[PDB]
Write an enzyme that holds these catalytic residues in place. Sequence first.
Site, PDB file in Angstrom:
ATOM      1  N   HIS F  48       0.903  -1.212  -0.115  1.00 23.13           N
ATOM      2  CA  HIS F  48      -0.016  -0.096  -0.117  1.00 23.13           C
ATOM      3  C   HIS F  48       0.884   1.272  -0.094  1.00 23.13           C
ATOM      4  CE1 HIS F  48      -3.097   2.793   0.931  1.00 23.13           C
ATOM      5  NE2 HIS F  48      -4.053   1.749   0.724  1.00 23.13           N
ATOM      6  N   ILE F  54       1.755   4.714   1.405  1.00 24.12           N
ATOM      7  CA  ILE F  54       0.425   5.717   1.667  1.00 24.12           C
ATOM      8  C   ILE F  54      -0.352   4.612   2.808  1.00 24.12           C
ATOM      9  CG2 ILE F  54      -1.721   6.625   1.358  1.00 24.12           C
ATOM     10  CD1 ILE F  54      -0.447   6.638  -1.656  1.00 24.12           C
ATOM     11  N   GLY F  57      -6.184   4.587   4.762  1.00 22.28           N
ATOM     12  CA  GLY F  57      -7.078   5.485   5.429  1.00 22.28           C
ATOM     13  C   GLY F  57      -7.824   4.595   6.199  1.00 22.28           C
ATOM     14  N   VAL F  58      -8.382   3.448   6.103  1.00 22.84           N
ATOM     15  CA  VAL F  58      -9.018   2.740   7.105  1.00 22.84           C
ATOM     16  C   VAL F  58      -8.512   2.223   8.322  1.00 22.84           C
ATOM     17  CG1 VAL F  58     -10.433   1.627   5.187  1.00 22.84           C
ATOM     18  CG2 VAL F  58      -8.652   0.370   5.993  1.00 22.84           C
ATOM     19  N   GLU F  62      -9.085   3.288  12.327  1.00 21.92           N
ATOM     20  CA  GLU F  62      -8.846   2.109  13.142  1.00 21.92           C
ATOM     21  C   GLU F  62      -8.234   2.661  14.489  1.00 21.92           C
ATOM     22  OE1 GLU F  62     -10.088  -0.585  13.851  1.00 21.92           O
ATOM     23  OE2 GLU F  62      -8.683  -1.229  15.528  1.00 21.92           O
TER      24      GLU F  62
END
Lengths: 150, 151, 152, 147, 152, 149
Positions: F48, F54, F57-58, F62
């Site tokens: 990623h 990067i 975003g999830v 979290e």
Amino acid sequence: SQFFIEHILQILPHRYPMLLVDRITELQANQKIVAYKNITFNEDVFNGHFPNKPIFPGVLIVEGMAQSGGFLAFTSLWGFDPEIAKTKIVYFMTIDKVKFRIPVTPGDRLEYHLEVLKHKGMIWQVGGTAQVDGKVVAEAELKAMIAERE
Amino acid sequence: QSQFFIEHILQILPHRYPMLLVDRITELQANQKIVAYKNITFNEDVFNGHFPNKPIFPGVLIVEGMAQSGGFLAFTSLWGFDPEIAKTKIVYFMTIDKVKFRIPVTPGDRLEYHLEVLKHKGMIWQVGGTAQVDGKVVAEAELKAMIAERE
Amino acid sequence: LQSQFFIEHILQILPHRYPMLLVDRITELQANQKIVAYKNITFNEDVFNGHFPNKPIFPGVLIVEGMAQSGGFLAFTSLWGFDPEIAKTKIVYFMTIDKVKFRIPVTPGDRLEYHLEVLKHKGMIWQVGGTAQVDGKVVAEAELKAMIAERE
Amino acid sequence: QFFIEHILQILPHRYPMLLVDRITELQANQKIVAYKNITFNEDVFNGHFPNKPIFPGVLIVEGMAQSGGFLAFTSLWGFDPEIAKTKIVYFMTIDKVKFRIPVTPGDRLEYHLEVLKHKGMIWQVGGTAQVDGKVVAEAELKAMIAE
Amino acid sequence: LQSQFFIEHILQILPHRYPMLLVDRITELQANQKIVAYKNITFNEDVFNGHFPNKPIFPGVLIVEGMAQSGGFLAFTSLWGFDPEIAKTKIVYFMTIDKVKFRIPVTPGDRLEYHLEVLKHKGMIWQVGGTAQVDGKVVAEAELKAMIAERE
Amino acid sequence: QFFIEHILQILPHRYPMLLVDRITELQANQKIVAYKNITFNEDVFNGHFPNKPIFPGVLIVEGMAQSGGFLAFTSLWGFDPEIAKTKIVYFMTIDKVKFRIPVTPGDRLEYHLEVLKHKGMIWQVGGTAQVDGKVVAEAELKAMIAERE
Ligand SMILES: O=c1cc(-c2ccc(O)cc2)oc2cc(O)cc(O)c12
Ligand SMILES: O=c1cc(-c2ccc(O)cc2)oc2cc(O)cc(O)c12
Ligand SMILES: [Cl-]
Ligand SMILES: [Cl-]
Ligand SMILES: [Cl-]
Ligand SMILES: [Cl-]
Ligand SMILES: [Cl-]
Ligand SMILES: [Cl-]
């Protein structure tokens, strides 16, 4: 004769965590291969096999034996040729007559001894032992087909 | 005792995966000497990074394994083989000096650590020696480590 | 002794942990006779980093291993039932493998179903044989003998 | 500043042995200031140590060496990814290292290296690793750039 | 444009790789309308080491991520079809996530099926909504807005 | 101010899913400031993305959830490792998530959550993820505290 990890990487498509041959010490076209893998605690497999009792999985000995048979079959047919290696697959069809006698543990030098039992067309049949310190720890027979990568 | 296997190392050293870098201890004289080794194989995660297409066991991890050999020597010299005392101990590096790397270490090498005690007082152990592959010196190192109760 | 076991039950019986616990669920179990279990195959497994780059194929030797672990679960629950206390005193040892065939390759998205039957058992020595199946097709076959040994 | 993307074009090191995140200062043939963030989400902390995460002192030194390496690469050839992709780095010597303060998750590990001496591919550097303005480690080292 | 895609095809369209490629197979695809895909859940995933010890639960946020990746696959292929050369130059970023609800825990042995449907699309901007399902039961629901961005 | 060792005693999360490194501020029933350091030396960056790291975003969301759970737990029971092992913070919903700036190796990923409302064991938190002053993400989250099974 002697192939190191750089050479093995150019012939086998296997990579971490499934490249289980560190060095080739003997290679005799169409006859036999002696190769080995060092066993160390610093391998991920030992996280789960087993906690507080590190034992190199029997099936991975058989796999390392398969990888040695495949390197022998390939180099017998084309020699050390990285370019042709990229275009080939050695598909393993059967495994037979495998016996585990002594467990393999961190600190062991796991030596694959494989000979050609039968070569007929695209089919290679290879057999032999895994050894630690001159002692037979495993034996196995294996059969593979050479094909084109796709 | 003088020969220790991975089960014994695990019971003395606090280090665990991916930072336990001694596989077997071949000889030790309490307060004096240790010889141990780690097998080097392609099937180690470090090699993904050091370096892609060119596997070279990092020099800093040779020093680390030498330190862990010294710390096994240190603990067993203090309390003998006592896993129950060991379980709550850690080891800290204090200093590293006079290290030289001579020969690259690669998969298929049996990396042998030879440490001698230069000076020790209580928990503070100063050890020096070599790492060897096939009887040749690949690295030299002097280091000081402290054994400490986890708190 | 129930017939369905989930991951939390398997953890309590098998000493295998990550990355070598290769059975996710038990669906069918007849003491001393047969087991049906399975492992889900996903791209999100570390093994696929090396086997092979750009071409994920679940290793044949690991299919056999999964079959062994299924057999070892059958072996243990047959003799002690669901007993985690005694399970902690045991380890499974591979003795032999024979008659293994690899017919169809196993890939991410496959449900690797293990079908094993007891061929012979006496004491701790268990001999099992069967197939690995994906969507009702025989993906592999194997026979193996194992021993449950005291952990010492 | 040089960001991770630029560091990747110069240093040959990759995961899990790339231990510099960002370069904040560069002076050719003089000094470099760089850092690595320390987070619990790193695989090393599984073994060093269980229930007590402490960033390995030897990896502080590795980070300092990699910082030194970046300074060595760029003083030699500037920012040239093409020449860099041929080379790797070899440790020659480590000396005069002292660890003063344990480094832990949540720390910003800052590398300060100056060049002591250089000749061709051989670079001798020295300096400190710092967390929040405090010296946590000292080291001197000599490295070699090789084909 | 086909309706069935396997891991070889997913790797050619998505830039995600281990340990963040969270779709194993696409069973159904209708351009500009919908996608049905799935990820297999196995104990043999590194994520389970820490979520949680002795209690493997597939992170809810990773259910969302898998849903997003399915949506991004649908988005890209709706516009360019199966074009690996162009996919290599594009990247889907998710701008917003709304109305996420977690109903049932996802565990090893589960087949985590993503059902995404296109709520709105103008150009590079795509709004998708749907569910994650296991055994035809809804385990999660989410809405997402994505952007087809340049990779460089 | 709580450090990783304190965090490990409260949260059941372990590697590679413990996404909070330090708690810098905590007001019971009110707010939390916490952070996670972002480094290249994380396994997630392998995928990623290759050649473009990067932080997902999830995973930002979290880390916000884990901070919000830490706030709810300590608000009620304080720093209590023993009670912690008997409790579960289970997240029911997530809403109003916006990603503004990408998070990369070298960033200090700072979580700012306040309690929006609570009734019994149901806690609603919301706020931002910030890097060097800027808002990189926002999110609202609703959690239920329950007994460990
Ligand atoms: O064991 C081997 C397996 C494979 C292989 C590669 C790709 C597949 O889909 C299946 C098998 O290629 C090989 C190529 C070689 O040159 C040598 C091998 O041992 C192997
Ligand atoms: O984080 C957790 C979440 C859940 C869960 C519970 C109910 C849902 O609808 C979705 C997820 O179960 C759990 C059960 C546990 O024993 C521990 C947990 O952390 C969780
Ligand atoms: Cl075994
Ligand atoms: Cl080095
Ligand atoms: Cl295979
Ligand atoms: Cl240290
Ligand atoms: Cl979750
Ligand atoms: Cl993202």
